Enzyme design. Structure first.
Site, PDB file in Angstrom:
ATOM      1  N   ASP C  95       0.871  -1.212   0.000  1.00 34.06           N
ATOM      2  CA  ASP C  95       0.000   0.000   0.000  1.00 34.06           C
ATOM      3  C   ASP C  95       0.897   1.248   0.000  1.00 34.06           C
ATOM      4  O   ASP C  95       1.529   1.568   0.987  1.00 34.06           O
ATOM      5  CB  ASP C  95      -0.880  -0.001   1.252  1.00 34.06           C
ATOM      6  CG  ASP C  95      -1.277   1.436   1.597  1.00 34.06           C
ATOM      7  OD1 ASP C  95      -0.962   2.320   0.817  1.00 34.06           O
ATOM      8  OD2 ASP C  95      -1.891   1.628   2.634  1.00 34.06           O
ATOM      9  N   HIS C  97       1.435   5.020   0.283  1.00 29.60           N
ATOM     10  CA  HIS C  97       0.744   6.261   0.743  1.00 29.60           C
ATOM     11  C   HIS C  97       0.675   7.293  -0.403  1.00 29.60           C
ATOM     12  O   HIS C  97      -0.196   8.140  -0.427  1.00 29.60           O
ATOM     13  CB  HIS C  97       1.552   6.878   1.892  1.00 29.60           C
ATOM     14  CG  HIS C  97       1.157   6.283   3.222  1.00 29.60           C
ATOM     15  ND1 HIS C  97       0.763   7.076   4.292  1.00 29.60           N
ATOM     16  CD2 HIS C  97       1.130   4.996   3.694  1.00 29.60           C
ATOM     17  CE1 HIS C  97       0.528   6.279   5.338  1.00 29.60           C
ATOM     18  NE2 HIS C  97       0.736   5.016   5.009  1.00 29.60           N
ATOM     19  N   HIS C 142       2.975  -7.466   9.920  1.00 29.77           N
ATOM     20  CA  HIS C 142       3.821  -7.361   8.701  1.00 29.77           C
ATOM     21  C   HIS C 142       4.670  -6.076   8.716  1.00 29.77           C
ATOM     22  O   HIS C 142       5.803  -6.073   8.277  1.00 29.77           O
ATOM     23  CB  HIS C 142       2.906  -7.344   7.480  1.00 29.77           C
ATOM     24  CG  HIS C 142       2.396  -8.733   7.214  1.00 29.77           C
ATOM     25  ND1 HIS C 142       2.600  -9.352   6.010  1.00 29.77           N
ATOM     26  CD2 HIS C 142       1.698  -9.613   7.976  1.00 29.77           C
ATOM     27  CE1 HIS C 142       1.972 -10.514   6.012  1.00 29.77           C
ATOM     28  NE2 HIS C 142       1.443 -10.720   7.201  1.00 29.77           N
ATOM     29  N   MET C 147       8.349  -4.840   7.012  1.00 29.42           N
ATOM     30  CA  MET C 147       7.810  -4.838   5.622  1.00 29.42           C
ATOM     31  C   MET C 147       7.334  -3.429   5.274  1.00 29.42           C
ATOM     32  O   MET C 147       6.155  -3.174   5.131  1.00 29.42           O
ATOM     33  CB  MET C 147       6.642  -5.820   5.503  1.00 29.42           C
ATOM     34  CG  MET C 147       6.394  -6.120   4.022  1.00 29.42           C
ATOM     35  SD  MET C 147       5.757  -7.782   3.841  1.00 29.42           S
ATOM     36  CE  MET C 147       5.674  -7.811   2.069  1.00 29.42           C
ATOM     37  N   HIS C 252      17.315  14.088  14.746  1.00 30.82           N
ATOM     38  CA  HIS C 252      18.213  15.185  15.236  1.00 30.82           C
ATOM     39  C   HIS C 252      19.696  14.872  14.903  1.00 30.82           C
ATOM     40  O   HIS C 252      20.247  13.888  15.354  1.00 30.82           O
ATOM     41  CB  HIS C 252      18.056  15.325  16.751  1.00 30.82           C
ATOM     42  CG  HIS C 252      19.300  15.943  17.329  1.00 30.82           C
ATOM     43  ND1 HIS C 252      19.380  17.295  17.637  1.00 30.82           N
ATOM     44  CD2 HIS C 252      20.521  15.408  17.663  1.00 30.82           C
ATOM     45  CE1 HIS C 252      20.611  17.525  18.131  1.00 30.82           C
ATOM     46  NE2 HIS C 252      21.341  16.410  18.167  1.00 30.82           N
ATOM     47  N   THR C 277      15.530  19.612  16.150  1.00 26.56           N
ATOM     48  CA  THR C 277      14.944  18.249  16.206  1.00 26.56           C
ATOM     49  C   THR C 277      13.558  18.325  15.575  1.00 26.56           C
ATOM     50  O   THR C 277      12.725  19.111  15.978  1.00 26.56           O
ATOM     51  CB  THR C 277      14.826  17.792  17.663  1.00 26.56           C
ATOM     52  OG1 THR C 277      16.122  17.732  18.243  1.00 26.56           O
ATOM     53  CG2 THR C 277      14.176  16.410  17.716  1.00 26.56           C
ATOM     54  N   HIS C 303      15.720  11.575  18.889  1.00 27.37           N
ATOM     55  CA  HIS C 303      16.099  12.266  20.147  1.00 27.37           C
ATOM     56  C   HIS C 303      15.670  11.403  21.296  1.00 27.37           C
ATOM     57  O   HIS C 303      16.461  11.132  22.178  1.00 27.37           O
ATOM     58  CB  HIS C 303      15.509  13.678  20.272  1.00 27.37           C
ATOM     59  CG  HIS C 303      16.510  14.556  21.015  1.00 27.37           C
ATOM     60  ND1 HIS C 303      16.232  15.135  22.254  1.00 27.37           N
ATOM     61  CD2 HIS C 303      17.796  14.943  20.721  1.00 27.37           C
ATOM     62  CE1 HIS C 303      17.313  15.823  22.649  1.00 27.37           C
ATOM     63  NE2 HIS C 303      18.277  15.722  21.747  1.00 27.37           N
TER      64      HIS C 303
HETATM   65 CU   LIG Z   1       3.447  -8.618   4.290  1.00 23.91          CU
HETATM   66 CU   LIG Z   2      20.111  16.661  21.847  1.00 27.82          CU
HETATM   67 CU   LIG Z   3      -0.023   3.498   6.176  1.00 27.44          CU
END
Ligand SMILES: [Cu+2]
Ligand SMILES: [Cu+2]
Ligand SMILES: [Cu+2]
Ligand SMILES: [Cu+2]
Ligand SMILES: [Cu+2]
Ligand SMILES: [Cu+2]
Ligand SMILES: [Cu+2]
Ligand SMILES: [Gd]
Ligand SMILES: [Gd]
Ligand SMILES: [Gd]
Ligand SMILES: [Gd]
Ligand SMILES: [Gd]
Ligand SMILES: [Gd]
Ligand SMILES: [Gd]
Ligand SMILES: [Gd]
Ligand SMILES: [Gd]
Lengths: 123, 336, 336, 335
Positions: C95, C97, C142, C147, C252, C277, C303
């Site tokens: 999948d 994004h 998974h 994965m 960081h 950071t 951090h």
């Molecule tokens: Cu899998």
């Molecule tokens: Cu630091």
């Molecule tokens: Cu996702």
């Protein structure tokens, strides 16, 4: 003699409680209130202490020693958590003259339910 | 404005609905400032949160976790009459992050069983915000019990992107996430009680671990799926407000994205764009607007995969329309 | 675009490398839209994660945790032939994004051992995004098993700051962070199993605690140190893409800072600047660009000090060049 | 050039203890100058809970969190650190606002009986967190309370996203610190004689990623009660907050962050109208808000559990006249 009471965020009857919530004492005894958790105090409730007794109010988080002189019933609350039911009944001497009056007085529903329990199941 | 000026403003009573649906309201304000009136009774009862029959003594504003989403415009004053029925056993109070003064209204709304009050505040800042009860000494307990929701104060002229263009949504849903902490016995089975106070000490112990036994949406694992699955059709624009008043989450629409997302839940703050997964810090509600382009079932949940599949933070939107191969097409379906 | 138009676009096959390196690619797109072709075989095997020899049955796309970073431009279509060898024992799926429709391609790529498919999606938004397998009912397992990886869709005109200036990096590394959850016996020692299924119930228990026993980069504590420590020289501009597809981190660079950091991993969203950071929410990949100014060894890590030194989330970059006292100078070395 | 750097005026500044801040001007006065500050590290045992819990604190300047140093962009901070012979652990300081040598940690390792002086040019504007980090024991020194934050303000002061100047009448620095105190089998916190005696037991608690206490100023209730900050209606106050090893989410109960540089960088535009911000472990931010209503307001990490059950909640007392327009109880609680 002395009776020790703890103030807790959570105990047998639920959140925000005095343990014990029913205190039997005689004139000259002391009641020592110990905040085991922070955020609690003890304060007498207006018109729910005997006729000639003095009103009292402790600071939050402080150990407070109450000396009881006048016979009768006293309903005390924790100032911040009164609306959440945090109360205790102190009975000084036998058959406190003002007990029925205190049970009938106006107060939060949750308070009333705990009061009724302590008089039944705490006496 | 002076008291006289506020007394002459038009008042409009609004009937609230139960999440994730929102009550009727216009994006663009219709008329000038007006005292919006909303009333919510608090009901402390027991709600089941999973399939195992787990039960949490919920403190719920309007009888639903999370409370209902109120919607007024910036400048309008929200007047809410809260009522704590004698049937309840604990004093509550409401603090709205979108208000200013009195701990968000909690210092002037403490009402014990059998008491009701009315508090009115001016909505001076535009953006979704989370409201939640917080009685002195037992704040965290009331919030975890499901006593929190969120209100949306929309700009008088509606919502607009970062350049000023107007973004209007055809459908809006409010998903309140809630992290619980249910006490278990020695064998690992959740414990059930008879009253709300009986589970206070055991619950606090679990809350201290900072590890929620269940994190879900709408007050129950699998609450916004099946008969409650949201709905949307290709070409529709939908705004999904989400709030967490006791835990940081990271929203993510599987199969889609947040075209424009006011992560901080403040309209004045420009909305990030093209977001795969956003971030809303405990104690804050945000909003994401996205136009659906493909039909099918999409899951929307806290990315913490564990929190979304093992705890219960995952809902599902069913969308109707025609598939668009240009955007995605299976050239070779799974075969040998 | 219609099918006839997509079929007439130039196809370019790209050989992927293994993190943290990235395959050859041009910042500015050369030519118009083109169907980029990438093929990755998934291999569920056993990999060590620490010096003690702890072993985790990893599910790895391309045989490496985290999978390899694919890079195309906005508008170009990514066509990926995935193959799940018969030697494996669990059905997977991918999948992305950065795609739109079919749960990010997971609903049209479920392939059981001995099956391979080909999914093509249009990269319509610029920014780094995290891809990860998510088989219905066993998603979190998974992903935690390793994965998941991340792809970078760069703006056709390359990357620019928040005002329009062009930012061109001399080198780019992709550090995928992975939080594992390894079961321990009564003596507190990690447990090893024979097949991936024998460690499913014990792992779930650890995953529920929301507390990873090891959080690292490149698939193992100390994977990017020693001869594998990244490299950079004073005056070199380096873009470090980082992804976490199951946990929030906070990157960081010790001794440095993120000059420009697209924390949300979206190019359209202006990049913060001068960051000590940053913060990338589980389920998302970001990117930080910084020009080194001082030579020496710098550690780059989450951090969460505990997560970076006690769990294993800390890599190291060796940098050659001349020291600059103007920026920093020890007036008095440690003495009596 | 070298002569130019050596000709810049050096000025020593006395530091105060949190949450207060030393004396400084928003707009820089004069050109660039080497600011000199000296802090002695003190390792001692401090109580951090009403039950007498004690944590061997490692503190820069004898206070957790260390003191906030404030200089302008371009100015160089020169800090003489000193580790007394009485101490028993070598330390070091790494300032996120510096560039080179792990933030100064590689050139500041000083064992008991040794002090050094490190100077770095503050080239970027914004609050930043500094913290000791001895190779191999970083997380322990930081959790023990060895971290604070410095604010490098733009030479022209702070301004909003449109260039308008934002000048604050007062500024407070609230350093949050998540501890990890070891408890025996009965659940009672354990105490030790020296700082190293509690190293193995503390590491075990730190691995759980669950702090036994999260507080501000080094103790539950350190900024509440008589120590609650202060502000009056119409006053603008900047509240810098830092967390060197744990992400928090600040929130002023009853108010809001008018302008909040969540990332703690001035160059990055400040969000606005914020109910609860977010500062990631290893970073310090800053929120500016003009008080409009008098009364007591609590300011704490929203994680309610962390703010009421752990100890991350302080309180500001504000004086002035109430404004009903903003909020008024039409009907006070009653039957
Ligand atoms: Cu899998
Ligand atoms: Cu630091
Ligand atoms: Cu996702
Ligand atoms: Cu109390
Ligand atoms: Cu409540
Ligand atoms: Cu709040
Ligand atoms: Cu130290
Ligand atoms: Gd329901
Ligand atoms: Gd419908
Ligand atoms: Gd087909
Ligand atoms: Gd390797
Ligand atoms: Gd070389
Ligand atoms: Gd030298
Ligand atoms: Gd003090
Ligand atoms: Gd004063
Ligand atoms: Gd009044």
């Amino acid at each position: 003699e002395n009776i020790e009471v703890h103030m807790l965020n959570k105990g047998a009857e639920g959140a925000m409680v005095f343990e014990p919530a029913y205190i039997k004492a005689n004139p000259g005894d002391t009641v020592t209130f110990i905040p085991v958790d922070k955020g609690h105090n003890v304060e007498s409730i207006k018109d729910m202490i005997p006729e000639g007794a003095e009103k009292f109010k402790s600071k939050i988080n402080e150990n407070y020693v109450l000396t009881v002189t006048q016979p009768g019933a006293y309903l005390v609350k924790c100032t911040p958590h009164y609306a959440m039911g945090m109360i205790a009944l102190i009975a000084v001497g036998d058959s406190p003259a003002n007990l029925d009056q205190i049970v009938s007085a106006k107060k939060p529903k949750i308070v009333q339910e705990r009061l009724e329990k302590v008089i039944a199941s705490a006496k | 404005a002076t008291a006289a000026e506020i007394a002459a403003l038009p008042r409009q009573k609004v009937e609230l609905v139960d999440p994730p649906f929102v009550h009727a309201h216009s994006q663009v304000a219709e008329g000038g400032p007006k005292v919006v009136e909303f009333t919510m009774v608090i009901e402390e009862k027991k709600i089941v949160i999973d399939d195992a029959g787990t039960e949490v003594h919920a403190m719920a504003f309007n009888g639903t976790v999370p409370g209902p989403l109120m919607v007024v415009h910036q400048d309008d004053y929200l007047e809410l009459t809260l009522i704590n029925p004698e049937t309840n056993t604990l004093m509550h109070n409401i603090d709205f992050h979108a208000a200013t003064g009195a701990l968000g209204g909690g210092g002037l709304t403490e009402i014990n069983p059998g008491e009701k009050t009315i508090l009115r505040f001016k909505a001076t800042k535009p953006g979704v915000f989370v409201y939640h009860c917080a009685p002195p000494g037992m704040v965290p307990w009331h919030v975890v019990s499901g006593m929190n929701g969120a209100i949306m104060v929309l700009p008088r002229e509606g919502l607009h992107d970062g350049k000023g263009k107007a973004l209007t949504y055809d459908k809006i849903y409010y998903v309140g996430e809630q992290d619980f902490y249910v006490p278990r016995d020695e064998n690992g089975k959740y414990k059930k009680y008879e009253a709300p106070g009986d589970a206070y000490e055991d619950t606090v112990k679990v809350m201290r671990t900072l590890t929620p036994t269940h994190v879900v949406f709408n007050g129950a694992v699998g609450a916004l799926t099946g008969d409650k699955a949201m709905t949307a059709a290709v070409g529709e624009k939908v705004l999904i407000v989400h709030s967490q008043a006791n835990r940081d989450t990271r929203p993510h629409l599987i199969g889609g994205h947040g075209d424009y997302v006011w992560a901080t839940g403040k309209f004045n703050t420009p909305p990030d764009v093209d977001q795969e997964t956003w971030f809303i810090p405990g104690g804050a509600a945000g909003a994401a607007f996205y136009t659906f382009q493909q039909p099918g079932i999409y899951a929307y949940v806290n990315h913490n995969l564990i929190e979304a599949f093992e705890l219960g933070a995952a809902a599902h939107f069913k969308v109707t329309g025609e598939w668009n191969d240009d955007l995605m097409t299976s050239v070779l379906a799974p075969s040998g």
